[PDB]
């Protein structure tokens, strides 16, 4: 008998004499709104079990699998899936590594974070301009309130080898889909300045807007504003000022009983927007902190567009980057006249067991044709035959294999194409934050080699394994160039009698 606190438990339904203790009448009381789960606990219908208690009991899964020797019943099977894994549609048809990758990946999805996001100032934020709820959803989505605040878009997907640009899990977007607003994501960043009051009763002053001899604002301060804080709405480019700060010239405190009443000048120590693409100021906020100082926060934003490099996911893994962006005229089309939005390679299915994506496509097509959101909850949900019947009732193929027409040459495709709506997410790992170039740049003071990181204009490591691989070719001059000429070259003087 264990009485400790800190053990993990689960509620089950006690079963005795081959009959579940929760009859239909108790379910009727629950559905009427009364007899909360606490009440079912009090009447003794449901019981908490830990793994220590489950060792001697006998639990059943479905109602059909009752034997007189059971003691408990599992209340629903899809408790076995967690909250993050709950978004996956038909994951019992998928493979386990796909579910693992989806769990590790859906947390990087771009979508609206909360209802109060535009009054919120965080250190990094990504918002999708046009969210959409997943067409093939799960009871977990209805429960954890996910469809109300979604993240991702429903793309019409044709599964075919459009060109060589769509090989090894890459994707092909539509130029007339991106430009109409597909995957249009905006990114927000925060910049904070605290105007500390030093012991000399000297504090930073934001004042000043530089003007040249012509009488107009300088290019460095084109969006600085009158007070010294960059105006909201104005464009900000690379190499400009939006908080024209100034720090006292007497950096060392050295508390002075002397007069020094006037001419306590300041030196310019501003924050410079050294980002690589344009951004807009959307909020400027000022506050007084707990220690009664001045606190300035600026929210910058940029509305990036999908391009080559951005990642996309399918809620079954199958991640990938956009490879090419083809115009609408070159994409296939069907009898109705629709062109797909994203084309994926059919080589991602044999090696990844991703049948759940196919069932999701068929269920989503049946849903959009019929008009209702269709459940795909794990261990159950909506079956395949009814969706096939809906697809044939509206006048389509049973497997979604609609006949297409190749826009390049106007001919009928000699093989049918899998066609339907799949829900895709745009991940935060985008090309525009990962491009890098070094040339000649800053050096560390202790080794006089290139620094590390793209936040310091650093370079790339040429590790020991790459050094061995270059040795493996017989490249001597290249190795000498890489590791001596252009990395840390130094002229030294050596005395060749002692040797130091």
């Amino acid at each position: 008998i264990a009485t400790d606190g800190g053990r993990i438990c689960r509620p089950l339904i006690i079963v005795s004499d081959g009959q579940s203790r929760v009859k239909d009448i108790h379910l009727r009381k629950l559905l009427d709104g009364e007899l909360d789960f606490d009440d079912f606990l009090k009447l003794g219908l449901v019981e908490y079990l830990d793994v220590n208690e489950e060792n001697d009991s006998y639990i059943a899964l479905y109602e059909k699998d009752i034997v007189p020797s059971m003691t408990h019943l599992e209340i629903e099977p899809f408790t076995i899936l967690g909250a993050v894994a709950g978004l996956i549609p038909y994951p019992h048809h998928n493979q386990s590594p796909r579910n693992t990758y989806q769990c590790a990946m859906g947390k990087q999805a771009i979508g609206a974070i909360a209802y109060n996001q535009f009054k919120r100032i965080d250190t990094l934020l990504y918002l999708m301009t046009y969210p959409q709820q997943p067409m093939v959803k799960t009871k977990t989505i209805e429960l954890i309130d996910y469809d109300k605040l979604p993240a991702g878009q429903n793309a019409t997907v044709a599964v075919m080898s459009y060109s060589g640009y769509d090989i090894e899990d890459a994707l092909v977007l539509n130029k007339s889909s991106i430009d109409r607003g597909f995957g249009r994501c905006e990114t927000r960043r925060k910049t904070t300045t605290v105007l500390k009051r030093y012991a000399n009763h000297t504090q930073d002053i934001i004042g000043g807007m530089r003007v040249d001899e012509n009488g107009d604002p300088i290019w460095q301060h084109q969006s600085l504003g009158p007070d010294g804080l960059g105006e909201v709405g104005m464009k900000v480019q690379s190499g400009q000022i939006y908080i024209n700060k100034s720090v006292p010239t007497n950096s060392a405190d050295a508390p002075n009983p002397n007069n020094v009443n006037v001419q306590t000048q300041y030196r310019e120590a501003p924050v410079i927007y050294r980002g690589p693409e344009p951004s807009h100021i959307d909020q400027v906020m000022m506050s007084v902190s707990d220690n009664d100082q001045a606190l300035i926060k600026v929210l910058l934003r940029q509305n990036r567009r999908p391009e080559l490099g951005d990642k996309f996911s399918s809620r079954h893994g199958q991640k990938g980057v956009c490879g090419i962006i083809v115009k609408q005229e070159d994409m296939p089309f069907n009898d109705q006249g629709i062109v797909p939005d994203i084309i994926m390679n059919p080589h991602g299915f044999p090696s990844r067991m991703t049948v759940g994506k196919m069932i999701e496509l068929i269920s989503g097509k049946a849903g959009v044709l019929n008009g209702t959101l269709e459940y795909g909850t794990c261990f159950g949900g909506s079956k395949l035959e009814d969706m096939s019947k809906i697809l044939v009732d509206q006048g389509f193929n049973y497997s979604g294999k609609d006949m297409l027409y190749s826009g390049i040459t106007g001919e009928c495709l000699q093989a049918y194409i899998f066609f339907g709506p799949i829900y895709y997410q745009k991940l935060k790992h985008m090309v525009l934050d990962k491009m890098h170039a070094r040339a000649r740049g800053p050096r560390a003071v202790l080794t006089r080699q290139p620094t590390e990181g793209r936040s310091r204009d650093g370079g790339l490591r040429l590790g020991e394994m790459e050094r061995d691989c270059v040795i493996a070719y017989g490249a001597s001059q290249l190795l000498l160039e890489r590791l001596m000429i252009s990395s840390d070259a130094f002229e030294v003087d050596v005395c060749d009698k002692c040797g130091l």
């Binding site: 579940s20 929760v22 239909d24 379910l27 009727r28 909360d36 109602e63 209340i75 629903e76």
Partner: peptide, 13 residues
Amino acid sequence: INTAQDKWHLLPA
């Protein structure tokens, strides 16, 4: 009207 199949309604509560 109510069956043993729709027993998952305990989970929302």
